Amino acid sequence: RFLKVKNWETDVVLTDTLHLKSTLETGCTEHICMGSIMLPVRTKDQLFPLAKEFLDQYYSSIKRFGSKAHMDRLEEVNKEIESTSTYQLKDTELIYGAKHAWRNASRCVGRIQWSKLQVFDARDCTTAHGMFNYICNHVKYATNKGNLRSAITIFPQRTDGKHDFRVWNSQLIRYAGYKQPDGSTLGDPANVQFTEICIQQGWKAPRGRFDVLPLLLQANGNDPELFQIPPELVLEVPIRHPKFDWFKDLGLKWYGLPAVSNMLLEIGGLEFSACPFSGWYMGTEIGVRDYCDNSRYNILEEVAKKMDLDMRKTSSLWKDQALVEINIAVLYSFQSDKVTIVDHHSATESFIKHMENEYRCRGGCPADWVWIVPPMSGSITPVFHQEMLNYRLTPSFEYQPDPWNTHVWKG
Amino acid sequence: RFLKVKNWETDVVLTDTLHLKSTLETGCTEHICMGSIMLPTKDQLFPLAKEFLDQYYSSIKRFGSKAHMDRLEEVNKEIESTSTYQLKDTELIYGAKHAWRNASRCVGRIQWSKLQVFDARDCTTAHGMFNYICNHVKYATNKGNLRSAITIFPQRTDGKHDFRVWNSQLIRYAGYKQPDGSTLGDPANVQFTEICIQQGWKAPRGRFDVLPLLLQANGNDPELFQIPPELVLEVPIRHPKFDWFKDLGLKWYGLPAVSNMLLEIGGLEFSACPFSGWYMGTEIGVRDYCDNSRYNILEEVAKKMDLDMRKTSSLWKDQALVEINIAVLYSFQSDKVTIVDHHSATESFIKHMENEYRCRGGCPADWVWIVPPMSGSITPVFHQEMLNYRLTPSFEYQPDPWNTHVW
Numbered sequence A: 001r002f003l004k005v006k007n008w009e010t011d012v013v014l015t016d017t018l019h020l021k022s023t024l025e026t027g028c029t030e031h032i033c034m035g036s037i038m039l040p041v042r043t044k045d046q047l048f049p050l051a052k053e054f055l056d057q058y059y060s061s062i063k064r065f066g067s068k069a070h071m072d073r074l075e076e077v078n079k080e081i082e083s084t085s086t087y088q089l090k091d092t093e094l095i096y097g098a099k100h101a102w103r104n105a106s107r108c109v110g111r112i113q114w115s116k117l118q119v120f121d122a123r124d125c126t127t128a129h130g131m132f133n134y135i136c137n138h139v140k141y142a143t144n145k146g147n148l149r150s151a152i153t154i155f156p157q158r159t160d161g162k163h164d165f166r167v168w169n170s171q172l173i174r175y176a177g178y179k180q181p182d183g184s185t186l187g188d189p190a191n192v193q194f195t196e197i198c199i200q201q202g203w204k205a206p207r208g209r210f211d212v213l214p215l216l217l218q219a220n221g222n223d224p225e226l227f228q229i230p231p232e233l234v235l236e237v238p239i240r241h242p243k244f245d246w247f248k249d250l251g252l253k254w255y256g257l258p259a260v261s262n263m264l265l266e267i268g269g270l271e272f273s274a275c276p277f278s279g280w281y282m283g284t285e286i287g288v289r290d291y292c293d294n295s296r297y298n299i300l301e302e303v304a305k306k307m308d309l310d311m312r313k314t315s316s317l318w319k320d321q322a323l324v325e326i327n328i329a330v331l332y333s334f335q336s337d338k339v340t341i342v343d344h345h346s347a348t349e350s351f352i353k354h355m356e357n358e359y360r361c362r363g364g365c366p367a368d369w370v371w372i373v374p375p376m377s378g379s380i381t382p383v384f385h386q387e388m389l390n391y392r393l394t395p396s397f398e399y400q401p402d403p404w405n406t407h408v409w410k411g
Numbered sequence B: 001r002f003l004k005v006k007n008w009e010t011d012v013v014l015t016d017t018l019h020l021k022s023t024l025e026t027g028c029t030e031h032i033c034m035g036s037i038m039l040p041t042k043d044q045l046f047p048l049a050k051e052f053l054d055q056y057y058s059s060i061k062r063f064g065s066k067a068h069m070d071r072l073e074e075v076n077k078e079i080e081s082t083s084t085y086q087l088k089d090t091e092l093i094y095g096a097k098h099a100w101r102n103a104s105r106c107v108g109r110i111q112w113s114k115l116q117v118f119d120a121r122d123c124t125t126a127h128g129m130f131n132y133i134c135n136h137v138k139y140a141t142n143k144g145n146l147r148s149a150i151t152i153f154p155q156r157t158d159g160k161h162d163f164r165v166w167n168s169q170l171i172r173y174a175g176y177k178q179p180d181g182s183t184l185g186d187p188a189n190v191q192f193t194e195i196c197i198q199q200g201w202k203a204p205r206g207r208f209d210v211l212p213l214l215l216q217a218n219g220n221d222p223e224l225f226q227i228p229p230e231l232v233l234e235v236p237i238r239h240p241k242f243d244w245f246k247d248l249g250l251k252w253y254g255l256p257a258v259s260n261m262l263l264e265i266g267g268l269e270f271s272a273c274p275f276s277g278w279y280m281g282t283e284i285g286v287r288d289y290c291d292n293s294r295y296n297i298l299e300e301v302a303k304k305m306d307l308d309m310r311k312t313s314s315l316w317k318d319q320a321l322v323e324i325n326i327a328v329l330y331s332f333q334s335d336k337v338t339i340v341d342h343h344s345a346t347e348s349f350i351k352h353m354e355n356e357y358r359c360r361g362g363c364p365a366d367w368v369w370i371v372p373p374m375s376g377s378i379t380p381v382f383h384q385e386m387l388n389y390r391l392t393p394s395f396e397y398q399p400d401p402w403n404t405h406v407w
C-alpha cells in the first residue's frame, strides 16, 4: 500500500510506505481523531518477537540480514530470554536503538540531527550517587562551554518493575516554583509540585525566581536521593533585548541546556526508565512557552507595559507584539553569549528537508503536525503547509507516569 | 467509550459522548493519524432521512410523536415513490444551522443558531441564481454590520442537473500570470481567473479586480455575471502608526462568503449553498497577505520598517506579520465593518465548547484548523484537547466543476 502527503505551498507530493512497519496504536479510529490529545513487568511471552523485530531492523541497517552473525545473535537472545526472562543489548545495538528512538519521535522538529547523538552507556550504574556522577558528566559534555552537543545517558533497564532507575526531575536543569500563601507563584509555576517534593525530601530552597532545582535520583527501586548539580556546570544566559535597554531590568535568564529526563526509552522490548537526553533549544520553547504561557512565567503584561502598547483592546495585538520582542530577546541573548540555539524558521526549514530525505531514503517520516508547528507565527513556517502522517515506530521514547505517583516508599 | 478532553491551561476536563453518534469516517485508523491531511439510491436514502428526522423531532421535544411517526411515514412514502424527497422549510433551516454547528474546523460556531437561511429551492436559471446571490450579499453585508447567511439552491437529483457556484467564494480578487514570470493579484485564483476569461470575461488585468460570478443552473453551461460594486464592501488597509502603509495599495473585501461546498441534510445533497459570516483578522493578514503562495508581501513590509532582514533569527517576518494584522483589524474597525481578532474568537470558541459539552455532550473540533495561524499558544485553544469526528448534517468538500462538467 501507499499513502501520499502533499505540501500545499510547493505542491511537492511524497509517498509513505514506512507506515506499514508500524505496529503500535495511535489512539485514533475510523470514527474519531485523537490527534490533539496530549497523552492518548513484561513477560517472556511477548518479549522475543519484540527482540526479534528489533534485531531484524538492526541487522538490515548494517547490511547483515540473514547472516550467521544475525542468526547467532537471535539464538543467543532467545536462550537468554527463556533462561533469564530478559536480555542484554550489545553496545552497538544500544547506540542504534537510542538514535532510532530519536529518529522515530514524531513530535520532534529537531530530527535532522538524529544520527549525531552521543550515547553514554550507564548500564553498570547501581546507586543514586553513581547516577549523579553520570548525569554531571552528561551535562558537562553536552554543554561544551555553550557549543551544545546532543547526548543521552542510559541507565539500567527495568527488570521486575520493582527496581526501576528513575530521574524524578522532568528535565535535568529547571527552575523551582513556589506557591505563596497569597496565591501568587514565585519562580516557575510549572515546577511547583516537584519543588514541594524536593523541599520535603530535605532540599533547602533559596526561594528565588530562578533557583536551579536539585537532582532527585532513584536507583534500583530505592528511595530517591537529593543532589545539587555543581553550579559551574549549569550554563545560564541573562536575557536582554538588542534595542530595548529596559528588558535586562526584568531580571530574566534561562538555562542553556534542555535535557529531558522523565521519558522511557523502549528498545527491542527492553524498557529504559531512566534515559536523560539533551539537544539545544528552539527559541520559542523559552520565548513563547516558558515566558508567555499564562500558566508559566507569564511576563507578557509587564513586557507590554514597558513597550507602552495599547493594552486595553486585545485587537491591538499587544500580546502578539510583546510575544515577538521577547522571542527576539531570547535569540539575541543566546547568540550574543555563543550558546547554541535555533530560531523557529531555521528549525522548521531544516525539518522539511529532513522529512523529504526520510521519505526517499526510508519510505516515510512519522510526524505530529500538532507538535511540529511552532507556537507562534505558524503559517509563515513551511511545516504549517506540510501534510504529515503520524504513526508509531520502535525503538521509541514513551511517556511514563511521574514516579512519585507509583513509588513504593521504603523510608 | 466515553472520552474526556483536558484543557492544560485550566485543568478543565470535559466528557464527550456526542462522538458516539458519529456516522462518517475520519481518515484515521489505529495505526495512522491523518489529522493534518487537508482532505482524507433508494436504499441508502431512507435511513439517512430517518436519522435526520429523528434528531430533528428530538430537538423540538416531539420524539415519539404522531407528527414524528407521520413525517417518517410520509418521507418514507415519498422516497419509495419519487426516489428522493423534499425537506420542510423547518427541517431545511434546522439542517443548515446544524451543518454549521457540526463544522469541526470552524472557530466561529458560537454563532451557529443565528444563521439566516434563504430558501432558493425554487431557482431555475443562472440569472435567478445571480438575483438570489445579490440579495444574499446585500443582506449579509448590511452596510458593514455583517449578518451570517446561507442561500440554498435546488438539491442534486441525478448528478446531471447540478446547481454549482464555480467561484470558491462569492467575492475574491483576480490573479493573472505575467510573462514577467511572477503573478499579478491573487495566485490562488489564477486558474479561476483564467476560466472566467476562457468563458468570456473581460479582465481589467488589475490586481484587486473583484472576480465575476460563474453560475451553473440545472447542469447547464455556467454564465458570467458582475456583482454590483455598490454591493461589494471593501476596506482600504492602513496602519494606525505607519503612514507609509497606505501606499502599499492594499485593500480587502468585508464579506467572506464560501461558495463551493456541498451541504448534506438527511441524505440530500445541496451542491450550491453559498454561505457567509465575517472574517477573523488572521485570515486576511496572516494567510491572504503573508502566505508565500498568495500576496506574499512580508518582504516589502519588512523593508519599509527597515528591519534586519539579513538573518531569520531577527524575527523580522514575525514583527511585520504582527503589524500587518494590527492594521487589518484597525482598518475594519475604523470603517465599522464586522471583524474578530484571533484572541476574541478563540476565547469565544472555548466558551462555545463548554456550552456544547454541557447542552449536547460534546463538540467535534479540528485543532489543526481551530488554532490560529499566528500566536497559537497565547490563544486558549492551543492548550485545549479536541476530539475530531464527522456529524451530519454537514458541509463537505466537492470536486471543482470544470474537472467534471459534461459540457
Ligand code: HEM
Binding pocket: A098, A102, A105, A107, A108, A109, A110, A111, A113, A117, A150, A151, A152, A277, A278, A279, A280, A281, A282, A285, A342, A347, A371, A397
Ligand atoms: C538537538 C536539537 C533539538 C531540538 C531543536 C529539538 C526540538 C524539539 C521541540 C521544539 C520539541 C517540542 C517540545 C515542546 O515544544 O514542548 C521536541 C520534542 C521531542 N524531542 Fe526533540 N529536539 C532536539 C533534540 C532531541 C534529542 C537529542 C532527542 C532524543 C535523543 C529528542 C527527542 C524528542 C522527543 C521524544 C520529543 C517528544 C516529547 C514529547 O512527546 O513530549 N529531541 N523536540
Ligand code: HEM
Binding pocket: B100, B103, B105, B106, B107, B108, B109, B111, B115, B148, B149, B150, B275, B276, B277, B278, B279, B280, B283, B340, B345, B369, B395
Ligand atoms: C460568523 C463568523 C465566522 C467566523 C469568524 C468563522 C471562522 C472560520 C475560520 C477562521 C475557519 C478556518 C478557515 C481558514 O482558515 O481558511 C473556518 C472554517 C469553516 N467554517 Fe466558519 N466562520 C464563521 C462563519 C461560518 C458560517 C456562517 C458557516 C456556515 C454556515 C461556516 C462554516 C465553516 C466551514 C464548513 C469551515 C471548514 C471549511 C473547510 O473545511 O475548508 N463558518 N471558519
Ligand SMILES: CN(C)Cc1cccc(NCc2ccc3ccc(N)nc3c2)c1
Binding pocket: A110, A170, A171, A258, A260, A261, A262, A263, A278, A279, A280, A281, A282, A285
Ligand atoms: C514532559 N516530559 C517529556 C519532559 C518535558 C518537560 C518540559 C518540556 C518538554 N518538552 C518535550 C521535549 C522533549 C525533548 C526535547 C529535546 C530538545 C528540545 N529543545 N526540546 C525538547 C522538548 C518535556
Ligand SMILES: CN(C)Cc1cccc(NCc2ccc3ccc(N)nc3c2)c1
Binding pocket: B168, B169, B256, B258, B259, B260, B261, B276, B277, B278, B279, B280, B283, B397
Ligand atoms: C475550498 N473550499 C474549502 C472553500 C473555501 C474557499 C476559500 C476559503 C475557505 N476557507 C474555509 C472557510 C469556510 C467558511 C468560513 C466562514 C467564515 C470565515 N471567516 N472563514 C471561513 C473559511 C474555504
Ligand SMILES: C[C@H](O)[C@H](O)[C@H]1CNc2nc(N)[nH]c(=O)c2N1
Binding pocket: A008, A384, A385, A386, A387, A388, B036, B037, B038, B368, B369, B370
Ligand atoms: C498541511 C495543513 O493541513 C494545512 O496547511 C492546513 C493547516 N491548518 C489550516 N488551518 C486553517 N484554519 N486553514 C487552513 O487552510 C489550514 N491549512
Ligand SMILES: C[C@H](O)[C@H](O)[C@H]1CNc2nc(N)[nH]c(=O)c2N1
Binding pocket: A036, A037, A038, A370, A371, A372, B008, B382, B383, B384, B385, B386
Ligand atoms: C491540547 C494540545 O494537544 C497541547 O496544548 C499541545 C499542542 N501542541 C504542542 N506543541 C508543542 N511543541 N508543545 C506542546 O506542549 C504542545 N501542547
Ligand SMILES: [Zn+2]
Binding pocket: A028, A029, A032, A033, A034, A035, B028, B029, B032, B033, B034, B035
Ligand atoms: Zn487521527
